Amino acid sequence: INDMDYPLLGSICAVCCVFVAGSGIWMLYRLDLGMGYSCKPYKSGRAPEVNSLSGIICLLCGTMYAAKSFDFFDGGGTPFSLNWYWYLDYVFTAPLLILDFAFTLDLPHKIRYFFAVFLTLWCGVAAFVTPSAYRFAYYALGCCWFTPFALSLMRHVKERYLVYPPKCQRWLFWACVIFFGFWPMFPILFIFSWLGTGHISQQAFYIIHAFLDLTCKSIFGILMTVFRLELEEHTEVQGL
Amino acid sequence: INDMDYPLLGSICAVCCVFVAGSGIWMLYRLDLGMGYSCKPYKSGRAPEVNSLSGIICLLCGTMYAAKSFDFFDGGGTPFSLNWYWYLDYVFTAPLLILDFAFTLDLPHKIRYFFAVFLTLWCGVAAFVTPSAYRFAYYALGCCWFTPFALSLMRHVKERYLVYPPKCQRWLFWACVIFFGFWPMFPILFIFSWLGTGHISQQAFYIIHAFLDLTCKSIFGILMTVFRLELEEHTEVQGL
Amino acid sequence: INDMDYPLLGSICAVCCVFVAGSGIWMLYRLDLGMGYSCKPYKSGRAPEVNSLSGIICLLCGTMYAAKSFDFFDGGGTPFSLNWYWYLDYVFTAPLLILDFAFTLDLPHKIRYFFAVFLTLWCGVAAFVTPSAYRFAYYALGCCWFTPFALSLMRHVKERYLVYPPKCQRWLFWACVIFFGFWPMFPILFIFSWLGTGHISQQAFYIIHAFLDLTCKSIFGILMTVFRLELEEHTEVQGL
Ligand SMILES: CCCCCCCC/C=C/CCCCCCCC(=O)OC[C@H](COP(=O)(O)OCCN)OC(=O)CCCCCCC/C=C/CCCCCCCC
Ligand SMILES: CCCCCCCC/C=C/CCCCCCCC(=O)OC[C@H](COP(=O)(O)OCCN)OC(=O)CCCCCCC/C=C/CCCCCCCC
Ligand SMILES: CCCCCCCC/C=C/CCCCCCCC(=O)OC[C@H](COP(=O)(O)OCCN)OC(=O)CCCCCCC/C=C/CCCCCCCC
Ligand SMILES: CCCCCCCC/C=C\CCCCCCCC(=O)OC[C@H](COP(=O)(O)OCCN)OC(=O)CCCCCCC/C=C/CCCCCCCC
Ligand SMILES: CCCCCCCC/C=C\CCCCCCCC(=O)OC[C@H](COP(=O)(O)OCCN)OC(=O)CCCCCCC/C=C/CCCCCCCC
Ligand SMILES: CCCCCCCC/C=C\CCCCCCCC(=O)OC[C@H](COP(=O)(O)OCCN)OC(=O)CCCCCCC/C=C/CCCCCCCC
Ligand SMILES: CCCCCCCC/C=C\CCCCCCCC(=O)O[C@H](COC(=O)CCCCCCC/C=C/CCCCCCCC)COP(=O)(O)OCCN
Ligand SMILES: CCCCCCCC/C=C\CCCCCCCC(=O)O[C@H](COC(=O)CCCCCCC/C=C/CCCCCCCC)COP(=O)(O)OCCN
Ligand SMILES: CCCCCCCC/C=C\CCCCCCCC(=O)O[C@H](COC(=O)CCCCCCC/C=C/CCCCCCCC)COP(=O)(O)OCCN
Ligand SMILES: CC(C)CCC[C@@H](C)[C@H]1CC[C@H]2[C@@H]3CC=C4C[C@@H](O)CC[C@]4(C)[C@H]3CC[C@]12C
Ligand SMILES: CC(C)CCC[C@@H](C)[C@H]1CC[C@H]2[C@@H]3CC=C4C[C@@H](O)CC[C@]4(C)[C@H]3CC[C@]12C
Ligand SMILES: CC(C)CCC[C@@H](C)[C@H]1CC[C@H]2[C@@H]3CC=C4C[C@@H](O)CC[C@]4(C)[C@H]3CC[C@]12C
Ligand SMILES: CC(C)CCC[C@@H](C)[C@H]1CC[C@H]2[C@@H]3CC=C4C[C@@H](O)CC[C@]4(C)[C@H]3CC[C@]12C
Ligand SMILES: *C\C=C(C)/C=C/C=C(C)/C=C/C1=C(C)CCCC1(C)C
Ligand SMILES: *C\C=C(C)/C=C/C=C(C)/C=C/C1=C(C)CCCC1(C)C
Ligand SMILES: *C\C=C(C)/C=C/C=C(C)/C=C/C1=C(C)CCCC1(C)C
C-alpha cells in the first residue's frame, strides 16, 4: 500500500549508502596501503585479487542502496526499483560475502557454499511474488537450502577457530557473531512481516532491513579487513 | 492453452525433483567419502573444487524442478513460474554441465564451450517469445552456435577416448551416449512441438522434457561421478 | 516513437553482425594457429584460456547484434528485443573487454575493474527506464563509478606502456586510443540523445552506437589479437 513514509525511507537509504560506500572505500584504501596491520608494500607489489572482495561488496551494496534511495525519493514504483523485488539485489551480494569469508579462512567447498546462498536467496525472491499458500513453499525450500548451509559452516569455522591466535580469534569471533547472529534473522523477519505473521509492517520492513545491512555488509566487511590485517601480519610479518 | 493436466505435471516434476536432488546428494556424499572407487581420505584432505560441480547441478536442477512443481500445483501462471520462459533455467545449468565435463576430461577451450552453450540456450529462449516467422531465426542462430559446439567436442572426446583404460572408457562411452544422443534431441523436440511442426502438444512437451532431464542432469552426473571414481583410482590409487 | 527507418537499422545491424562475428572467428582461428606473430604450436599444445576472451566477445557481440537485426527486421517491439533495454547487452560484454585487457597487460585489480564496468553499465541501464529527473541521478552514479575507473586505468596503462617494445607499444597505443577515445563517448551520446539534451534523435542513436561497436568490440579485439601476437613472439619466440 502506497502510504508509507517514503522520504524517511529515502533518507535512511541515503544515509546507509554513504556509510556502506565510505566503509568500502576505506578498506579498499587500507588494503593497498600495506599487508600487515601496520604496513607492508607486498612482496610482489600487488595485493591478492580475492582480498578485495570485501571492499567491492560494500561499494556494490552502496551502489545498490544508492539506487534504492533514488527509488524512494521518487515516491517508489520506479521502473528500475530494486525494492519491488526483494532480495534480488542480495542475489548479487550475499553469495560474494560467503565467498570472501571462504577465501579469508581458506574454507574448502567454496563453490558449494556459493550456490547454497545463491539458491537460498532465489527461493526467497520467489517467495513473495506468489500471492498464495505456496509463498511458504518457496520459503521452506530456501530453508532446506540454508539450514545445511548454516550448518557445515559452523563446523568448518569451529574447527579452524582453535588454530588462529587469540588476537585474530577476536575479530573472527565477532565476524561469526555477525555471521551466525544476523543472517538467521532474515528468515525470521520474513515470517513476522506482512508476508507471513504480519507483526512487521511494510514501512518497518524496509527500515529494519536497511539497518540489517551495515552489520552484514559494512561492519562485517570492516571486521574481515581488520581480521585480515591481523591474519596477514601474524602470518607474514610476525611469521606465525 | 490452460487445459493441460496440471496436477499430473506437478506430480511428474515432484517425482523427478526428488530423484535429481537425491542423486545429487549421493554424489556429493560419495565425493567426500573417498577419492578412489573404493575410498581415499585425500592427500591434502579436501576434494578439488571443480569435482563438486556435477553434484551441485543436480541440486540446482532439483531446486529448479521443485519450483516447477510448485508452479504446476498452483495451476500454473504463477509470478515466479520457471515454466513460462522455457530453457531459462537451462541457462543456469546447461553451461555448467559441459564445464564439469571439460574439467573431468581436462578438455581445453572450456571458456569457449561455456559461452557456446550459454549463447545456444539464450537463442533458444528468444525463439518462442517471438510469435512470428523470426521464431526460427533465433532457432537457426542457436543451431549456428550449437553445431560447431556439437562438433569440436566430438573431436576432443574422440581423441582422448583412446587414452583412457577400458574400465574408464566404459562410463565415458555411456556419458558420450548421454551427451551426443540426447542433447541433439532438444532441437528436434522444438521443431516438432506446437512452436514448430506441431506433432508434440504442450502437455506432452513438459512431460518429455521432464523425462529428458534425469538422463541429462542426474544420470549423466551419476556416470560422471562413477567415471571420476574410476579415473581417480586408476590415476592415483592404481598409479596409472 | 515508431517512425524510424527500421529496415535501415536491421541492415546496419546485420552488416556489423557479420563484420563482428567474422572478426571474432578470425582471431579465434588465428589464436590456435600459432603463438608468435608467425606461428608456434604451443609448448603444452593448447592456448591459454584467457587469451580467447577477445574472440568470444566478438561472437558474443555478433550474436547480440544478430538478435538486434532480427528485432529491427520484425519492425521492433519484439518480446525478446535487446534494443528496448539499452546497454543491457553491454552488461554481458563490456565487463569482459576490460577483463581481457587486464589479462593481456597483466594489470592487477582485475576484479575491481570488472565490477566497476559491470556496475557502471547497470547504472546506465537504470538511467533511461526512469522518466523523471532521477534519470540523471543514475547517470551521475554511473559516472561516479566510471571516472575512478577511467582513471587508475590510465595510471597502470601508462606505467606499463614504457616497458613494452615500440613494436608492441604501437598496437597498445592504438588500443588505448580505442579505449580512452571512444568509451568516454558513450556518456556524451547519452547527454546529447533525446534522453538528455536532445541533439541526437532516436534513429541516429542506434546507428551511431552500431558504428561505435566495431571499434569497441571488433577492431579493439583485432588490435588485442595482433598486440598479443607481437607480445607472444617478442616474449617467447624472440625471448624478450
Ligand atoms: C543501480 C546499480 C544496480 C546494480 C546491480 C543491478 C542488478 C539487479 C537488477 C534489478 C532489476 C530491476 C527490476 C525492477 C522492476 C520494477 C517494476 C515496477 O516497479 O513495477 C511497478 C510499477 C507500477 O507502479 P505505478 O505505475 O506507480 O502504480 C501506481 C499507480 N499510479 O510498474 C512500472 O513502473 C512499470 C515498469 C516498467 C518496466 C520495468 C523495466 C525494468 C528495468 C529493466 C532493466 C533490468 C534488466 C533485467 C534483465 C531481464 C530483462 C527483463
Ligand atoms: C527457485 C530456485 C530458482 C533458482 C534459479 C532462478 C533463476 C531463474 C530466474 C527465473 C525468472 C522467473 C520469471 C517468471 C515470470 C513469469 C511471468 C508469468 O507467469 O506471467 C503470466 C501471468 C498471467 O497469468 P494469469 O494472470 O494466470 O492468466 C490467466 C488469466 N486468469 O502473469 C502474471 O502472473 C504476472 C507476473 C507478475 C510479475 C512477474 C514477476 C517475476 C518475478 C521476478 C523475480 C525474478 C528476477 C528477474 C531479474 C530481472 C528483473 C525482471
Ligand atoms: C540472442 C542472444 C542473446 C545473448 C545474451 C542475452 C542476455 C540479455 C537478456 C535480454 C533480455 C530481453 C528483454 C527484452 C524485453 C522486451 C519488452 C518489449 O519489447 O516490450 C515492448 C512491447 C510493446 O510493443 P508493441 O505491443 O509492439 O507496442 C506497439 C503497439 N502495437 O511489449 C511486448 O511485446 C510484450 C513483451 C512480452 C514479454 C517479454 C518477455 C521477455 C523475454 C524473457 C526472456 C529473458 C529472461 C530475463 C530473465 C528474468 C526474467 C524476466
Ligand atoms: C528437490 C528439493 C530441493 C533440492 C535441494 C534441497 C537442499 C539440498 C540439501 C543440501 C545441499 C548442499 C548444501 C550446500 C552447503 C553445505 C556445504 C557442504 O555440503 O559441505 C560439505 C559438508 C561435508 O564436508 P566434509 O568434507 O566432511 O568437511 C570437512 C572439510 N574437509 O557437508 C556436510 O557437512 C553434510 C551436510 C550438512 C550437514 C548438516 C547436517 C544436518 C542438516 C539439516 C538437514 C536439513 C534438511 C536438508 C535435507 C538434506 C540435507 C543433506
Ligand atoms: C552474427 C552471427 C552469430 C555469430 C556467431 C555464430 C556462430 C559462431 C561459430 C562458432 C563459434 C565458436 C564455437 C564454440 C564452440 C567450439 C569450440 C572451439 O571452437 O574450439 C576450438 C576448435 C579448434 O581447436 P584446436 O585447438 O584445433 O583443438 C585441438 C585441441 N588443442 O575449433 C574447431 O574445432 C573449429 C570450429 C568447429 C569445427 C566444426 C567444423 C564444421 C562446423 C559446422 C559449421 C556450422 C556453421 C557455423 C559457421 C561458422 C563455423 C566456424
Ligand atoms: C553510495 C554511492 C555509490 C558507491 C560507490 C560510488 C563510486 C565508488 C568510487 C570508486 C570505486 C572503485 C573504483 C573501481 C575501479 C578502480 C580500480 C581501483 O581502485 O584500483 C586501485 C587503485 C590504486 O591502486 P594501487 O595498488 O595504488 O596501483 C598500483 C598497482 N599495484 O585505486 C586508485 O587509483 C584510487 C582511486 C582512483 C584514482 C582516481 C583519482 C580521482 C578519482 C575521481 C573521483 C570521482 C568521484 C568518486 C568518489 C570516490 C573516488 C575514490
Ligand atoms: C552498537 C553501535 C554500532 C555503531 C555502528 C558502527 C560504526 C562504525 C565504527 C566501527 C564499526 C566496526 C569496527 C570494528 C572494530 C575495529 C576497530 C579497531 O579498533 O580497529 C583497529 C584498527 O583497524 C581500523 O582502523 C578499523 C576501524 C576503522 C573503521 C572506520 C569506520 C567506517 C568507515 C566509514 C567512513 C566514511 C563514512 C561516511 C560518514 C557517515 C555518514 C552517515 C584494530 O586494532 P585495535 O583492536 O584498535 O588494536 C590496536 C593496535 N592494533
Ligand atoms: C532404462 C531404465 C532407466 C532407469 C532410470 C535410472 C535409475 C537409477 C539407477 C542408476 C542409473 C545410472 C547408474 C549408472 C551405472 C552405475 C551403477 C554401478 O554399477 O556403479 C558402480 C558403483 O557406483 C555406484 O554406486 C553408482 C550407482 C549408485 C546410483 C544411485 C541411484 C541414484 C541415487 C538416488 C537416491 C535417492 C532417490 C530418491 C528416490 C526416488 C523417488 C522417485 C560402479 O561399479 P560396477 O560397474 O558395479 O563395478 C563393480 C566393482 N567396482
Ligand atoms: C577509418 C576506416 C576504418 C575501417 C574499418 C576497419 C576494417 C577492418 C580492417 C582492419 C581494422 C583493424 C586492423 C588493425 C591493424 C592490423 C593490420 C595488420 O597489419 O596486421 C598485421 C598482421 O595481423 C593481421 O593479420 C591483422 C589484420 C587482419 C584483420 C582482418 C579484418 C577483420 C576480419 C573480418 C573478416 C570477415 C568479415 C566479413 C565481411 C564483412 C561484410 C560486411 C600486423 O603486422 P603489420 O604491422 O602488417 O607488420 C607486418 C610484419 N608483421
Ligand atoms: C544474539 C545473537 C546476535 C548472538 C547469539 C550467537 C552466539 C551465541 C553465537 C554466534 C557465533 C558463535 C560462535 C562461533 C564460533 C565459535 C568457536 C568455537 O571454537 C566455540 C564456539 C564459538 C565461540 C561459537 C559460540 C556461539 C556463538 C558465539
Ligand atoms: C540413439 C542414440 C541415443 C545413440 C546414438 C549415438 C551413438 C551412435 C554415438 C553417441 C556417442 C558416440 C561415441 C562417442 C565416442 C567415441 C569414441 C571414439 O574413439 C570412437 C567413436 C565413439 C565410440 C562414438 C561412436 C558413436 C556414438 C556411440
Ligand atoms: C523419455 C526420454 C526423453 C528419456 C527417457 C530415456 C532414459 C531415461 C533412458 C533411455 C535408455 C536408458 C539407458 C539404458 C542403459 C543404461 C545402462 C546403465 O548401466 C546406465 C544407464 C543407462 C545408460 C540408461 C540411462 C537411462 C536411459 C538413457
Ligand atoms: C580524439 C580521440 C579519439 C583520441 C584522443 C585520445 C588521445 C589524445 C589519448 C588516447 C590514449 C592516450 C595515450 C595512452 C597511453 C599513453 C602512454 C604514456 O606512456 C604516455 C601518454 C600516452 C601516449 C597517452 C596520450 C594521450 C592518448 C593518446
Ligand atoms: C544482505 C545480505 C545477506 C547476507 C542476506 C541474506 C539473506 C538470507 C540468508 C535470507 C534467507 C532466506 C531463506 C533462508 C529462506 C526464506 C527466504 C529468505 C530470503 C528470508
Ligand atoms: C537441461 C539441460 C540441457 C543440457 C539442455 C540443453 C539444450 C540444448 C542444447 C538446446 C539447444 C537449442 C538449440 C540448438 C537451438 C534452438 C533452440 C534449442 C533451445 C532447442
Ligand atoms: C559496447 C561496449 C562498451 C565497452 C560500452 C561501454 C559503455 C560505457 C562505459 C557507458 C557508460 C555510462 C556511464 C559512464 C554512466 C552513464 C550511463 C552510461 C551507460 C552511458
* DSSP per-residue codes, chain A: -TTS-HHHHHHHHHHHHHHHHHHHHHHHHHHHH-SSSS----SSSS--SGGGHHHHHHHHHHHHHHHHHHHHHTTS--SS-SSSSTTHHHHHHHHHHHHHHHHHHT-S-HHHHHHHHHHHHHHHHTTTS--STTHHHHHHHHHHHHHHHHTTHHHHHHHHHTTS-HHHHHHHHHHHHHHHHHTTHHHHHHHHBTTTT--B-HHHHHHHHHHHHIIIIIIHHHHHHHHHHHHHIIIIIS--
Q: Is A216 exposed, middle or buried (0-12, 13-18, 19+ CB in 10 A)?
A: buried
Q: What is the DSSP string of B99-119?
A: HHHHHHHT-S-HHHHHHHHHH
Give residue ranges with CB within 6 A of ligand 12: B 174, 208, 211-212, 214-215, 219
Distance A179 CA to ligand 4 centre (A): 18
Cα(B21)–Cα(B15) distance, integer angstroms: 10
Q: Which residues pair with B193 in a beta bridge?
A: B200
Distance from CA of A65 to the nearest CA of B (A): 24
- Distance, in Å, from the CA atom of A63 to the CA atom of A14, rounded to the nearest integer, reads 10
Closest CA to C23 of C59, C67, C53, C51: C59
Q: Which of C19, C27, C31, C224 to mutate to test the pocket of ligand 9 (most atoms within 8 A of CB)?
A: C19
Residue B230: CB partners within 8 Å, gap ≥ 6? Answer: B37, B165, B167, B168, B170, B171
Cell of C59: 561472437
Collect all residues with Cβ–Cβ distance below 8 Å to B3 and sequence separation of at least 6. none
Which of A20, A53, A60, A80 is best to mutate for the C interface (most C CBs within 10 A)? A80
SS3 assignment, position B152: coil
Q: Which residues of B touch A119 (CB under 8 A)?
A: 59-60, 63
Mutation target for B interface from A84, A85, A134: give the one with most B CBs within 10 A: A134
From ligand 13's centre to the CA of C177, what distance in Å?
6
Which residues of chain C does A73 touch, with a Cβ-Cβ cutoff of 8 Å?
134
Cβ of C11: how many Cβ atoms within 10 Å?
Answer: 14
Residue nearest ligand 15's atom 20 by CA: B187
Ligand 1 in contact with A81 (CB < 6 A)?
A: yes
Q: Determine whether the shortest distance from the Cβ of A162 to ligand 10 is under 6 A.
A: yes
A73 touches chain C (CB under 8 A): yes
User: What CA–CA distance (Å, rounded) separates C90 from C68?
Assistant: 13
| CA proximity to C111, closest of A115, A46, A98 | A46
Nearest CB to C111; choose among A49, A67, A78: A49
Q: How was this structure determined?
A: cryo-EM
Given A112, A130, A141, which is nearest B66 (Cβ)? Answer: A141
Instruction: From the CA of A187, give the closest atom in ligand 14.
Output: 20
To one decimal, the resolution in angstroms is 3.4
Cell numbers given for B2: 490452460
Q: In a mutational test of the pocket of ligand 11, which residue from B153, B156, B161, B211 has the highest number of ligand atoms less than 8 Å from its CB?
A: B161
Residue reference for cell 552453450: B117
Q: What's C126's DSSP letter? A: T
Which amino acids bring their CB within 6 angstroms of ligand 6?
A 17, 21, 25, 32, 45-46, 59, 62-63, 66; C 108-109, 112-113, 116, 144-145, 147-149, 151-152
| CB spacing of B52 vs A129 below 8 angstroms | no
The Å distance, Cα B70 to ligand 2 centre, comes to 13
C162 CB-contact burial (10 Å; exposed 0-12 / middle 13-18 / buried 19+): exposed
Crossing angle of the two packed helices C6-33 and C220-232, in degrees rounded to 10:
10
User: What is the C-alpha radius of gyration for chain C, rounded to an integer number of angstroms?
Assistant: 19
Partner residues linked to A155 by β-bridges = none
**Of C201, C207, C193, nearest in space to C72 by CA:** C207
Partner residue opposite B111 with nearest CB, options C49, C66, C80: C49
Alpha helices by DSSP H, listed for chain C, are 6-33, 53-73, 88-105, 110-125, 135-150, 153-161, 166-182, 185-192, 202-213, 220-232
Please say whether the beta carbons of A184 and A148 come within 8 A: no
